[PDB]
Design a protein around this ligand. Structure first.
Ligand SMILES: [Ca+2]
Lengths: 186, 149
């Protein structure tokens, strides 16, 4: 959003008014394809849109009904590269479908009123990955100008990043843009 | 022919007072720097050079201020007057004049010196420093143009 002070539309109304803008130069926004060169003093940093947990491996403990204690040994669960969550013991592969680094956490669960162990899906939500998003801050290119609230597809160092122009800094020295990769790639 | 230096109290104004620092009793000599300094913001990536925006910085002008009084009384009255006139107005307009141009620079009093090392008839030789507000601008008349059949 962009706040703007402007005199009332009707000529009869002499009031000066303040409004909030959620409008664009095009009613039906179109996607642009551009390139960002290293010369534009590019600043790359990763943002997270959705909050999802960071320990991909789970040492899950289930409390024993008879002892009302955690007497029973734990069951280890690993998240594959695809997105699915499996028990570590059940794995029969070569390690290609598993992550490059093991981020782990120990989880404690209480048995439900029925007595059944907690659902695989409920554990999955806690070990599930968060939206890794790339942010690019660079100088305004006069050859292809990029204004705020424009859908863009940026090419940077041989890699394609897709998203929108969120902010714009008007300084004495430069004119810079904040590019936010919206994700939703596959 | 030669260079002229006027000191205006309020240029464009009815209450203007002009001091000839080239011909009058109070004279300005040996300006420190009339040029300019610039900061180009050049950042280099892998030997290749990229240039930002040039902030043209203007440096303080320091003049060798000399007084040409006939008596100790005159030379003191010239210092008590000239320096206070610069103080009375928040800023003073220095006019640079030559055969080719007549530029102006708005100055503010940075530092003035008063010492007891006198010559003959109580002569003054002191250093006056000014801070730059706006360096070199053309003050000229603007008129409309007429169209003929
Ligand atoms: Ca004035």
């Amino acid at each position: 959003p962009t706040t703007t002070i402007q005199h009332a539309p009707s000529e009869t109304d002499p009031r000066n008014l303040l409004f909030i803008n959620f409008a664009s130069r095009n009613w039906n926004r179109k996607r642009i394809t551009t390139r960002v060169d290293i010369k534009q003093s590019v600043t790359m940093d990763t943002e997270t849109i959705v909050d999802r947990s960071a320990y991909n491996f789970a040492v899950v403990f289930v409390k024993n009904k008879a002892t009302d204690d955690y007497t029973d040994p734990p069951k280890m669960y690993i998240a594959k590269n695809n997105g699915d969550v499996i028990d570590y013991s059940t794995y029969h592969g070569d390690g290609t479908d598993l992550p490059d680094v093991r981020t782990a956490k120990t989880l404690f669960y209480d048995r439900d009123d029925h007595g059944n162990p907690p659902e695989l899906s409920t554990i999955k939500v806690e070990i599930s990955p968060s939206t890794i998003v790339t942010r690019l801050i660079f100088n305004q290119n006069e050859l292809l100008p990029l204004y705020v609230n424009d859908l863009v597809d940026i090419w940077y160092e041989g890699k394609l990043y897709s998203g929108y122009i969120a902010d714009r800094v008007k300084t004495e020295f430069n004119d810079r843009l904040i590019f936010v990769e919206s994700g939703d790639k596959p | 022919m030669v260079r002229q230096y006027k000191i205006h109290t309020n240029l464009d104004g009815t209450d203007d007072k002009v001091w000839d620092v080239t011909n009058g009793k109070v004279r300005f000599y040996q300006p420190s720097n009339l040029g300019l300094q610039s900061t180009n913001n050049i950042w280099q990536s892998n030997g290749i050079g990229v240039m930002g925006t040039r902030s043209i910085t203007q440096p303080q002008i320091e003049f060798k201020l000399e007084t040409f009084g006939e008596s100790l009384e005159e030379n003191y009255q010239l210092m008590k007057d000239f320096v206070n006139d610069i103080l009375s107005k928040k800023f003073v307009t220095l006019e640079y004049q030559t055969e080719i141009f007549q530029v102006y620079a708005d100055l503010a009093l940075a530092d003035v010196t008063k010492t007891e090392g006198y010559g003959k008839n109580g002569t003054f030789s002191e250093k006056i420093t000014f801070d730059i507000i706006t360096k070199w601008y053309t003050y000229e008349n603007l008129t409309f143009d007429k169209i003929q059949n």
